[PDB]
RNA sequence: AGAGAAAUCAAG
RNA sequence: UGCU
RNA sequence: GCCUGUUUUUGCU
RNA sequence: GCAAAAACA
């Protein structure tokens, strides 16, 4: 490490880019998360009492501790009730305008906020199918069951399908009837916890822990819940000076560098991380928080009601354990369950739920990030306090502006205490305060008299993304040139990932040495001309955002006749299936559909070479909104607002385009007679 | 902002504080229903003149005491629950402007004032169309239809409707069986109301301790770790062939090996090196696919399971326990040094051959004169030609993946230098690999050319003696597993040479910036702890270590590795604080060294750097 | 065997 | 069956 | 196998 | 809007 440490030219806050081994393996997870799971569990129950009792901690609902029961040696979980009330009070105080604009979303913004908004998810966990899918097909599934459970067509407002979500609960059994035919039966008691159920599972590709951890995902019945609050709290924080989560990127380094004002006899900067974060937090202390917001500002009963929703239903949490903990008698390995034999996490087995174990305190998941940020900034709002905080979700920055050392740690001290008070641990081992201030981390962003570039972040991306010649080049140079813009990379290591990346993509499509593709060329004399058929390198440091087919044609590197033929609209390599329609600006005919090629020959596509009812019917939606684009160009601009159902708007749509189409009344006639 | 278009400025900045729009049902909807309300009453009155005084007087709006001053001089008294939205002059009788949903069966609301019905088309009811005029009903019948274009436009259909007929849902309830649900794991219900005063205590704290000395890593102790990875590093070696293809060289490398064991070990039997001469042989005819033979069983693995799974069952006694799996601690091996100082040795050629980009503009010439310098600053150096070898055989590797053969599959590894001339550094054998995963390993027998044995860093490679052109070479022929994400990762091992590139590009470009003139051959002095001590040392041998370190750190990268160098970050910052005479301070449990002590278990690369962080001074003054 | 690290691959 |  | 949030790059509808 | 990739928490 002394390699890494030098003394004269550079500072080791630049070479902060060598504590790097990227471009090496990263490490993945292999066998059961059982371990893992039960630990996450059980971490909540040891923090609750300065003296780890667990069993005395499961009987608990609502973790709420007196101060004196608060663990200032170590995590503690729990909040104090009065401290949630007051802090959030001196919150919403403070940053009127945060709260003006909260008032804003929730009159105007709210309603227009739409439940496709859930589809943008990844993998969600399904409750019909008892598996992890994808967010379109799990929310189109749940659409259905609400529909035909309710006996009514859900609103495309986020409210509307909350509202029928608690519907739903309201019923004693409800049926789900889907093609393969197949019908599953819910009671009561069963969709819910199924609504309370979070599918666990491991994170793979991970780096920068030793441990593995693990991450959840809650089903669709909750995921719309919680994109209201989370709506909301990007909202409040957007307006804060004290958050750094709703900003990234260069935003949240001219944010950061706002605060970097040390100007008074003692200027400290404390940086660190909160330690078990996400299962210090009680979901009830959110809810206190947003409960206080919200009759502060006015709000009626509704709201209130809609915002504790998700909350509760993670206080009501079922974290879905994993295939068993390992046991073995001599070398032999099998799995059980929990409650089978005797393990570390018998405390736990009067939790278990089937094959999921249920947790009232933490929030054992990364779902409320935003609200967790307001949580930790409602507790920085206080007298003593006077310093410059930022905090995203559990990584926070601190500047202190003091007369003397003793006020700056008094100051650090109650900043450590206030966050104790709403369930949020500093971690002592991760928390660094340096005196004068002037070199601090943030975010893995470290600062000594400016933000340095961290190279070794962006190397990742440098392989080629293997989608086409052209996609690949142009998406590797913007990444290239991004990296140069944000000065994460200068001109050399620019220009050395330039080449790096350029030799990779040339190998990656047969463009170097003697391959089938070099030999094919070579025997049928075809020059290559492009960088993707071996050609020299037409782009540079400077032309990173420049095309290559325009440039190679300015240069002159390209001739007239080989441009005809490469950016062919008719070429076979990347014609279509179906035709496709055209505008034509200023003319009788606005519309002409026909037969179509991507222009370029070099943008084909590769054989990928290997719920089907549900793609049948995402196949169907695709034929539906392709004929609805075809004939309503409109929508291709604005919302969709035409009255009436698909069939007959596309109907009407579909004749006033004939009496305009500039023909015979009998044609016109004929063409009308075969409509459907 | 939330203004409707339709809606003017003056009315709905107006309309902000009239009543409070956030407790009422659709409170946005309900603010454009009244400035559309306010805007008819506006249109009514459009400067008319009775009696040199404007014709209409307009209650909506306005502060109730002028309201009651102006009715009390014109002899008319109104309750405060109902008040007229405005007043004629002429037939004097109070009006009030409506919105209903249907103009039919429609009746008066109230006896002290009359309606001014109007439907969401802009059509009037007949008294209200025949007490006012044509160009009034023109005018309001326009707004409202640029109303109801709006509302169309924005699919508001609906919480419009529900807002002009008067009732409507409060748009969120829940039940009673669903609040029993909710409140199943909670102390309050679904609005909380704590009786607790709010207030925040006084707890007493603890006191911020100072780091005066830099934290100590911990060495553990325990034998010295082999050389764990794919291939061998700086002690790789290659013969060099005469020029041609691939199948010639393997041809060539055959026809005239005499293979000798000179060194077994337990781990990889001697006995498969028949699997390597007939994959040899195999490629040498030009079909590189074999058949499988009674010693691949050994080499690659195969069945391994079924015994292992057989055995375990024959000896399986006792009672069950839980797993307690562990983790061998191993010391830091003498050979990580002598792999630095091997891997810095001069070679040759330059081993780093990439197509320079094109130049058009003087910063692109400063750009690839830079890259130009810092290929020849580390070009010629052993770490650049391993790191060759490791990119040819992980991608000639990785390229026969994918597919699920039953068969071997020989992927020879050969670079060929600036003459023609091939250079086989060794083969890599890939077995039966029915991978479905990117996790899954794949079977390999990695066969290579060794410039020098050692028993302790290569305790499960099987040493060979090869006999080509009257020269004497070894063989490692180590059997492993290898997965295909691992395999994909070092296809792209290039990418190792940004880092001391970026450091070199740092020192060169901010030397050029501090004089404001670009030099391109400087060449300065660097200050580190070598032994302990602050010795002198120039930029580009101190480039070339830190490739050789950062090749030596990729290769060797797993969650100890990552652990430790996500934890030594603060640690290094902590360092580059204290010689700039900046005092560090901790919370009261604050050890972060732990943090680090704990990714301290096995990887010698890891003890490696604790052992260069430790001899480094702790202390500043 | 081996890869590997808090338990998986090395077949069904 | 050929990336310095 | 492949969560949540923020930011970024590219391509196609 | 969708799809792919990357970084951070």
């Given at each position: 490490?002394?390699?890494?440490?030098?003394?004269?030219?550079?500072?080791?806050?630049?070479?902060?880019?060598?504590?790097?081994?990227?471009?090496?393996?990263?490490?993945?997870?292999?066998?059961?998360?059982?371990?893992?799971?039960?630990?996450?569990?059980?971490?909540?129950?040891?923090?609750?009492?300065?003296?780890?009792?667990?069993?005395?901690?499961?009987?608990?609902?609502?973790?709420?501790?007196?101060?004196?029961?608060?663990?200032?040696?170590?995590?503690?979980?729990?909040?104090?009730?009065?401290?949630?009330?007051?802090?959030?009070?001196?919150?919403?105080?403070?940053?009127?305008?945060?709260?003006?604009?909260?008032?804003?979303?929730?009159?105007?913004?709210?309603?227009?906020?739409?439940?496709?908004?859930?589809?943008?998810?990844?993998?969600?966990?399904?409750?019909?199918?008892?598996?992890?899918?994808?967010?379109?097909?799990?929310?189109?599934?749940?659409?259905?069951?609400?529909?035909?459970?309710?006996?009514?067509?859900?609103?495309?407002?986020?409210?509307?399908?909350?509202?029928?979500?608690?519907?739903?609960?309201?019923?004693?059994?409800?049926?789900?009837?889907?093609?393969?035919?197949?019908?599953?039966?819910?009671?009561?008691?069963?969709?819910?916890?199924?609504?309370?159920?979070?599918?666990?599972?491991?994170?793979?590709?991970?780096?920068?822990?030793?441990?593995?951890?693990?991450?959840?995902?809650?089903?669709?019945?909750?995921?719309?819940?919680?994109?209201?609050?989370?709506?909301?709290?990007?909202?409040?924080?957007?307006?804060?000076?004290?958050?750094?989560?709703?900003?990234?990127?260069?935003?949240?380094?001219?944010?950061?560098?706002?605060?970097?004002?040390?100007?008074?006899?003692?200027?400290?900067?404390?940086?660190?991380?909160?330690?078990?974060?996400?299962?210090?937090?009680?979901?009830?202390?959110?809810?206190?928080?947003?409960?206080?917001?919200?009759?502060?500002?006015?709000?009626?009963?509704?709201?209130?009601?809609?915002?504790?929703?998700?909350?509760?239903?993670?206080?009501?949490?079922?974290?879905?354990?994993?295939?068993?903990?390992?046991?073995?008698?001599?070398?032999?390995?099998?799995?059980?369950?929990?409650?089978?034999?005797?393990?570390?996490?018998?405390?736990?087995?009067?939790?278990?739920?089937?094959?999921?174990?249920?947790?009232?305190?933490?929030?054992?998941?990364?779902?409320?990030?935003?609200?967790?940020?307001?949580?930790?900034?409602?507790?920085?709002?206080?007298?003593?306090?006077?310093?410059?905080?930022?905090?995203?979700?559990?990584?926070?920055?601190?500047?202190?502006?003091?007369?003397?050392?003793?006020?700056?740690?008094?100051?650090?001290?109650?900043?450590?205490?206030?966050?104790?008070?709403?369930?949020?641990?500093?971690?002592?081992?991760?928390?660094?305060?340096?005196?004068?201030?002037?070199?601090?981390?943030?975010?893995?962003?470290?600062?000594?008299?400016?933000?340095?570039?961290?190279?070794?972040?962006?190397?990742?991306?440098?392989?080629?993304?293997?989608?086409?010649?052209?996609?690949?080049?142009?998406?590797?140079?913007?990444?290239?040139?991004?990296?140069?813009?944000?000065?994460?990379?200068?001109?050399?290591?620019?220009?050395?990932?330039?080449?790096?990346?350029?030799?990779?993509?040339?190998?990656?499509?047969?463009?170097?040495?003697?391959?089938?593709?070099?030999?094919?060329?070579?025997?049928?004399?075809?020059?290559?001309?492009?960088?993707?058929?071996?050609?020299?390198?037409?782009?540079?440091?400077?032309?990173?955002?420049?095309?290559?087919?325009?440039?190679?044609?300015?240069?002159?590197?390209?001739?007239?006749?080989?441009?005809?033929?490469?950016?062919?609209?008719?070429?076979?390599?990347?014609?279509?299936?179906?035709?496709?329609?055209?505008?034509?600006?200023?003319?009788?005919?606005?519309?002409?559909?026909?037969?179509?090629?991507?222009?370029?020959?070099?943008?084909?596509?590769?054989?990928?070479?290997?719920?089907?009812?549900?793609?049948?019917?995402?196949?169907?939606?695709?034929?539906?909104?392709?004929?609805?684009?075809?004939?309503?160009?409109?929508?291709?601009?604005?919302?969709?607002?035409?009255?009436?159902?698909?069939?007959?708007?596309?109907?009407?749509?579909?004749?006033?385009?004939?009496?305009?189409?500039?023909?015979?009344?009998?044609?016109?006639?004929?063409?009308?007679?075969?409509?459907? | 902002?939330?203004?409707?278009?339709?809606?003017?400025?003056?009315?709905?900045?107006?309309?902000?504080?009239?009543?409070?729009?956030?407790?009422?049902?659709?409170?946005?909807?309900?603010?454009?229903?009244?400035?559309?309300?306010?805007?008819?009453?506006?249109?009514?009155?459009?400067?008319?003149?009775?009696?040199?005084?404007?014709?209409?007087?307009?209650?909506?709006?306005?502060?109730?005491?002028?309201?009651?001053?102006?009715?009390?001089?014109?002899?008319?008294?109104?309750?405060?629950?109902?008040?007229?939205?405005?007043?004629?002059?002429?037939?004097?009788?109070?009006?009030?402007?409506?919105?209903?949903?249907?103009?039919?069966?429609?009746?008066?609301?109230?006896?002290?004032?009359?309606?001014?019905?109007?439907?969401?088309?802009?059509?009037?009811?007949?008294?209200?169309?025949?007490?006012?005029?044509?160009?009034?009903?023109?005018?309001?019948?326009?707004?409202?239809?640029?109303?109801?274009?709006?509302?169309?436009?924005?699919?508001?259909?609906?919480?419009?409707?529900?807002?002009?007929?008067?009732?409507?849902?409060?748009?969120?309830?829940?039940?009673?069986?669903?609040?029993?649900?909710?409140?199943?794991?909670?102390?309050?219900?679904?609005?909380?109301?704590?009786?607790?005063?709010?207030?925040?205590?006084?707890?007493?704290?603890?006191?911020?301790?100072?780091?005066?000395?830099?934290?100590?890593?911990?060495?553990?102790?325990?034998?010295?770790?082999?050389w764990?990875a794919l291939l061998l590093g700086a002690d790789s070696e290659y013969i060099?062939?005469?020029?041609?293809?691939?199948?010639?060289?393997?041809?060539?490398?055959?026809?005239?090996?005499?293979?000798?064991?000179?060194?077994?070990?337990?781990?990889?039997?001697?006995?498969?090196?028949?699997?390597?001469?007939?994959?040899?042989?195999?490629?040498?005819?030009?079909?590189?696919?074999?058949?499988?033979?009674?010693?691949?069983?050994?080499?690659?693995?195969?069945?391994?399971?079924?015994?292992?799974?057989?055995?375990?069952?024959?000896?399986?006694?006792?009672?069950?326990?839980?797993?307690?799996?562990?983790?061998?601690?191993?010391?830091?091996?003498?050979?990580?040094?002598?792999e630095?100082?091997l891997l810095?040795?001069?070679?040759?050629?330059?081993?780093?051959?990439?197509?320079?980009?094109?130049?058009?503009?003087?910063?692109?010439?400063?750009?690839?004169?830079?890259?130009?310098?810092?290929?020849?600053?580390?070009?010629?150096?052993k770490v650049?030609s391993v790191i060759e070898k490791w990119?040819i055989a992980?991608?000639?590797?990785?390229?026969?993946?994918?597919?699920?053969?039953?068969?071997?599959?020989?992927?020879?590894i050969?670079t060929?230098?600036?003459?023609?001339?091939?250079q086989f550094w060794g083969?890599?054998?890939?077995?039966?690999?029915?991978?479905?995963?990117?996790?899954?390993?794949?079977?390999?027998?990695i066969?290579e050319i060794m410039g020098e044995?050692?028993?302790?860093?290569?305790?499960?490679?099987?040493?060979?003696?090869?006999?080509?052109?009257?020269?004497?070479f070894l063989?490692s022929?180590?059997?492993?597993?290898?997965?295909?994400?691992?395999?994909?990762?070092?296809?792209?091992?290039?990418?190792?040479?940004?880092?001391?590139?970026?450091?070199?590009?740092?020192?060169?470009?901010?030397?050029?910036?501090?004089?404001?003139?670009?030099?391109?051959?400087?060449?300065?002095?660097?200050?580190?702890?070598?032994?302990?001590?602050?010795?002198?040392?120039?930029?580009?041998?101190?480039?070339?270590?830190?490739?050789?370190?950062?090749?030596?750190?990729?290769?060797?990268?797993?969650?100890?590795?990552?652990?430790?160098?996500?934890?030594?970050?603060?640690?290094?910052?902590?360092?580059?604080?204290?010689?700039?005479?900046?005092?560090?301070?901790?919370?009261?449990?604050?050890?972060?060294?732990?943090?680090?002590?704990?990714?301290?278990?096995?990887?010698?690369?890891?003890?490696?750097?604790?052992?260069?962080?430790?001899?480094?001074?702790?202390?500043?003054?």
């Amino acid at each position: 490490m002394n390699l890494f440490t030098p003394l004269s030219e550079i500072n080791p806050t630049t070479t902060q880019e060598l504590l790097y081994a990227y471009t090496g393996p990263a490490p993945v997870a292999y066998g059961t998360r059982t371990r893992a799971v039960l630990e996450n569990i059980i971490r909540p129950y040891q923090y609750f009492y300065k003296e780890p009792n667990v069993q005395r901690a499961l009987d608990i609902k609502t973790g709420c501790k007196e101060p004196e029961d608060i663990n200032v040696e170590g995590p503690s979980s729990g909040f104090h009730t009065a401290s949630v009330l007051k802090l959030a009070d001196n919150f919403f105080r403070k940053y009127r305008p945060a709260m003006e604009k909260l008032k804003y979303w929730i009159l105007v913004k709210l309603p227009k906020l739409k439940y496709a908004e859930l589809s943008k998810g990844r993998q969600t966990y399904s409750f019909i199918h008892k598996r992890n899918l994808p967010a379109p097909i799990a929310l189109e599934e749940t659409v259905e069951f609400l529909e035909q459970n309710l006996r009514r067509k859900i609103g495309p407002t986020l409210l509307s399908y909350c509202q029928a979500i608690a519907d739903v609960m309201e019923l004693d059994e409800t049926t789900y009837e889907g093609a393969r035919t197949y019908t599953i039966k819910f009671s009561r008691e069963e969709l819910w916890d199924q609504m309370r159920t979070l599918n666990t599972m491991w994170k793979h590709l991970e780096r920068g822990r030793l441990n593995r951890r693990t991450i959840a995902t809650p089903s669709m019945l909750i995921r719309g819940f919680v994109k209201i609050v989370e709506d909301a709290a990007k909202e409040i924080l957007e307006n804060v000076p004290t958050s750094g989560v709703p900003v990234g990127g260069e935003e949240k380094l001219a944010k950061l560098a706002s605060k970097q004002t040390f100007h008074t006899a003692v200027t400290g900067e404390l940086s660190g991380d909160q330690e078990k974060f996400n299962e210090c937090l009680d979901p009830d202390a959110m809810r206190l928080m947003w409960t206080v917001f919200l009759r502060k500002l006015g709000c009626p009963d509704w709201i209130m009601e809609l915002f504790n929703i998700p909350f509760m239903v993670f206080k009501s949490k079922l974290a879905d354990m994993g295939e068993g903990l390992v046991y073995t008698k001599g070398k032999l390995t099998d799995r059980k369950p929990l409650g089978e034999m005797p393990s570390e996490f018998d405390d736990l087995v009067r939790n278990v739920v089937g094959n999921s174990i249920s947790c009232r305190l933490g929030m054992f998941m990364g779902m409320y990030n935003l609200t967790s940020t307001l949580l930790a900034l409602i507790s920085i709002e206080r007298e003593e306090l006077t310093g410059s905080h930022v905090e995203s979700s559990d990584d926070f920055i601190h500047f202190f502006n003091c007369k003397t050392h003793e006020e700056m740690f008094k100051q650090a001290e109650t900043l450590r205490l206030t966050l104790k008070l709403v369930g949020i641990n500093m971690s002592p081992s991760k928390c660094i305060l340096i005196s004068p201030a002037g070199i601090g981390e943030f975010n893995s962003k470290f600062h000594h008299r400016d933000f340095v570039g961290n190279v070794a972040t962006e190397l990742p991306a440098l392989v080629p993304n293997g989608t086409n010649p052209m996609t690949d080049l142009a998406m590797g140079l913007n990444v290239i040139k991004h990296s140069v813009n944000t000065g994460q990379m200068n001109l050399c290591t620019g220009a050395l990932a330039m080449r790096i990346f350029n030799h990779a993509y040339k190998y990656a499509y047969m463009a170097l040495g003697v391959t089938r593709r070099t030999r094919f060329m070579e025997e049928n004399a075809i020059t290559p001309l492009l960088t993707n058929q071996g050609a020299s390198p037409v782009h540079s440091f400077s032309t990173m955002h420049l095309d290559e087919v325009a440039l190679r044609r300015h240069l002159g590197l390209l001739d007239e006749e080989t441009l005809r033929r490469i950016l062919n609209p008719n070429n076979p390599v990347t014609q279509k299936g179906d035709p496709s329609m055209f505008f034509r600006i200023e003319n009788k005919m606005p519309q002409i559909m026909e037969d179509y090629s991507v222009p370029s020959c070099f943008k084909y596509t590769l054989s990928r070479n290997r719920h089907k009812a549900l793609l049948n019917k995402e196949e169907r939606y695709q034929r539906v909104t392709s004929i609805i684009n075809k004939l309503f160009p409109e929508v291709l601009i604005q919302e969709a607002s035409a009255p009436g159902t698909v069939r007959e708007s596309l109907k009407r749509r579909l004749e006033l385009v004939v009496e305009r189409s500039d023909l015979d009344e009998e044609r016109k006639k004929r063409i009308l007679s075969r409509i459907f | 902002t939330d203004r409707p278009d339709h809606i003017d400025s003056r009315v709905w900045e107006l309309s902000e504080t009239q009543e409070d729009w956030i407790t009422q049902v659709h409170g946005h909807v309900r603010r454009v229903v009244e400035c559309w309300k306010y805007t008819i009453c506006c249109l009514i009155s459009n400067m008319h003149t009775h009696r040199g005084a404007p014709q209409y007087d307009v209650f909506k709006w306005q502060d109730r005491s002028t309201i009651e001053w102006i009715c009390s001089k014109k002899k008319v008294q109104y309750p405060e629950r109902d008040t007229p939205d405005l007043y004629d002059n002429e037939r004097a009788v109070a009006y009030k402007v409506l919105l209903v949903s249907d103009l039919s069966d429609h009746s008066p609301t109230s006896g002290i004032y009359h309606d001014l019905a109007f439907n969401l088309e802009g059509e009037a009811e007949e008294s209200c169309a025949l007490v006012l005029r044509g160009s009034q009903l023109q005018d309001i019948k326009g707004f409202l239809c640029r109303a109801l274009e709006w509302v169309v436009s924005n699919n508001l259909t609906q919480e419009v409707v529900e807002t002009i007929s008067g009732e409507a849902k409060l748009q969120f309830s829940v039940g009673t069986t669903f609040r029993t649900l909710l409140k199943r794991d909670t102390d309050w219900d679904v609005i909380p109301t704590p009786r607790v005063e709010p207030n925040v205590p006084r707890i007493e704290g603890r006191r911020w301790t100072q780091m005066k000395k830099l934290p100590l890593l911990k060495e553990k102790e325990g034998p010295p770790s082999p050389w764990r990875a794919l291939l061998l590093g700086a002690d790789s070696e290659y013969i060099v062939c005469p020029p041609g293809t691939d199948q010639e060289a393997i041809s060539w490398i055959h026809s005239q090996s005499e293979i000798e064991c000179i060194r077994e070990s337990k781990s990889t039997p001697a006995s498969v090196i028949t699997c390597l001469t007939s994959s040899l042989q195999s490629f040498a005819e030009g079909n590189p696919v074999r058949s499988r033979i009674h010693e691949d069983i050994i080499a690659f693995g195969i069945n391994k399971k079924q015994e292992k799974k057989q055995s375990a069952s024959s000896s399986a006694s006792g009672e069950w326990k839980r797993a307690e799996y562990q983790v061998e601690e191993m010391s830091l091996p003498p050979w990580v040094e002598e792999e630095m100082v091997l891997l810095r040795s001069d070679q040759e050629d330059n081993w780093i051959e990439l197509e320079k980009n094109a130049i058009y503009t003087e910063v692109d010439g400063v750009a690839e004169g830079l890259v130009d310098k810092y290929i020849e600053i580390v070009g010629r150096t052993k770490v650049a030609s391993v790191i060759e070898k490791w990119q040819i055989a992980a991608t000639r590797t990785f390229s026969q993946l994918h597919t699920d053969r039953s068969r071997i599959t020989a992927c020879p590894i050969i670079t060929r230098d600036p003459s023609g001339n091939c250079q086989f550094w060794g083969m890599v054998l890939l077995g039966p690999h029915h991978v479905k995963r990117d996790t899954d390993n794949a079977p390999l027998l990695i066969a290579e050319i060794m410039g020098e044995d050692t028993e302790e860093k290569y305790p499960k490679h099987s040493v060979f003696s090869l006999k080509v052109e009257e020269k004497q070479f070894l063989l490692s022929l180590k059997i492993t597993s290898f997965s295909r994400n691992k395999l994909y990762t070092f296809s792209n091992i290039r990418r190792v040479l940004i880092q001391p590139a970026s450091i070199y590009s740092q020192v060169v470009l901010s030397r050029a910036a501090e004089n404001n003139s670009l030099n391109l051959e400087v060449n300065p002095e660097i200050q580190l702890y070598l032994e302990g001590a602050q010795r002198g040392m120039t930029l580009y041998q101190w480039v070339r270590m830190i490739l050789c370190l950062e090749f030596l750190m990729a290769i060797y990268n797993n969650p100890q590795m990552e652990g430790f160098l996500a934890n030594m970050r603060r640690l290094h910052m902590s360092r580059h604080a204290m010689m700039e005479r900046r005092q560090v301070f901790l919370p009261f449990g604050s050890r972060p060294e732990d943090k680090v002590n704990e990714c301290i278990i096995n990887n010698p690369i890891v003890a490696y750097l604790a052992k260069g962080w430790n001899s480094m001074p702790n202390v500043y003054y």
